[PDB]
Amino acid sequence: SRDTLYEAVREVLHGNQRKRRKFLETVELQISLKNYDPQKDKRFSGTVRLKSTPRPKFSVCVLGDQQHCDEAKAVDIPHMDIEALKKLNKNKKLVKKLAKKYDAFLASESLIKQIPRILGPGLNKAGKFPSLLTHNENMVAKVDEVKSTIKFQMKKVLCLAVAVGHVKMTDDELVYNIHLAVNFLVSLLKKNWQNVRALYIKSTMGKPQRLY
Amino acid sequence: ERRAMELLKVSKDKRALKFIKKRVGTHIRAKRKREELSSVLAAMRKAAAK
């Protein structure tokens, strides 16, 4: 459990061969896992926290019958109170497509009378649990929830992928994200000696190329 | 020292620590030598990368 040292961890400005598109790209962190069983009780999962979150692209489900409902319509999202929940019945799961369609949900003062129910755990470790600490109020912080925290999980492919960088925000805001990302990964890393094989570099879309 | 580098390549940390301890002496010297060999192993890995 020893991957480390920040003497020469710099000069990440070279992104001409990777990024030549019009829009802004997502530089991701991936790793190759070894000595891990996919099906049994071996579970590698956790919540890595960043301070300055660059740009996670994901959709947010918004529900409410208050001023939040009136102010969330300026985001130009298809917001709808009860017919949107009526559209998502128990038929879109019988249909083979995934009946989730949202990576985030709402937990605010409109649904605070409906939230204290028996429904507890779920996709909290997957990272689909709204809370008041991470700004899921959605009248002003709906735009700010585009910049949200990150999390990671495992599946049967036996690989890891998380979004830690974006070459809008400069690399001075991303280097501290790299510091905190590896600082939480070493702390959150059963007995497993040196799981870190090779940290990957990643952009939005493309072809393979080796650089550490 | 090249044998200790080969033990670092085949990743046997406990046997490498015991071997470096048997060669140089005390455990403080062995722990410092293991970290110095890991640092130059990372330097050689960076040199083999570019």
Next chain:
Amino acid sequence: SLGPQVAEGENVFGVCHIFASFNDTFVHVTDLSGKETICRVTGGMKVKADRDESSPYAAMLAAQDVAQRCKELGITALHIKLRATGGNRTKTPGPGAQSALRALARSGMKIGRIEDVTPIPSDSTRRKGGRRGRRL
């Protein structure tokens, strides 16, 4: 233990050094040189008695067993080197060879040349025995 050569054109040759003394019988099948063997049986394997190792029925059974083992490896024809006791004592083969040469013929083994390779001495040292001889 298989023959890759053609079965119709040419049959696989070997030799058998048939040793037959008065109380011992070998059936030793070897190649044409003699350095590399194929199989070898003794009378003690068949009969658990040293008084009748040179038996005609046991020699017939041993010859049929060696012929079956030889057809398992795939050698069709055999030359017959008929050894005897030899030396300075006697020059007479045992009675088991007369049964064994008929048994290996009736078992289905092709017969080539038959000759003796008995170590016949011309002029040698003193024969084992006293002046008066074998008293009984």
Next chain:
Amino acid sequence: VVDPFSKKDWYDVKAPAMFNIRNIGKTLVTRTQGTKIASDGLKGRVFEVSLADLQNDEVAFRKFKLIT
């Protein structure tokens, strides 16, 4: 527990052109397994081929000795 005569190849025995019949027979030869050489193991051997088997239309009582 294994059969000894399993990994044995068969090499054909050749005669010089001054006689009639080219082929004589075959003899089990081990493969070239690493250090040892099959041609080195097949260095000194002596066969026994009669004159009637060597030359076709001649006498039969005479014999020779053929070294390989």
Next chain:
RNA sequence: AAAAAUGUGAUCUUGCUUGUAAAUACAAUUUUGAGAGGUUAAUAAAUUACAAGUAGUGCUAUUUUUGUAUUUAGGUUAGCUAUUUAGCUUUACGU
């Protein structure tokens, strides 16, 4: 068995993996008829139920209507063959 939907953060009962059952004929019979083996057990085979992980899902888990009433009952699981008329397999496609 298919359809309102308040819900339990909107939201279904898990084709997978791991631990448990307690089900899952005997005989004929290739050594062996008998008492175990090495059935069986333990305990990574599988169909059903429980819990975990998560491939399966926001765990746990909820409600209205329809399938009412043509309640039905009979029957096809229709063949192959022949130009047509028609002939005509208890279903062989090793038999």
Next chain:
RNA sequence: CUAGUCUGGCACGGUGAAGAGACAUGAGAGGUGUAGAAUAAGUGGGAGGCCCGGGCCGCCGGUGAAUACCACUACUCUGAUC
């Protein structure tokens, strides 16, 4: 209990070739449960961006997560050794 003697280990005291066994590196082939016109190749992908106003497959009908622009990966052979 020892001179003396025997044996084993450590440094003095290296090299070239063949044979057997184990480990690692640079590369090229490399993926067909149901189903889909197609080795679903792979996950966060992305509805689009590349090149010279125009070029590609899409989103998806159908699979339990579908092609361009970012990584060598669970893993099967070829494979040259400072």
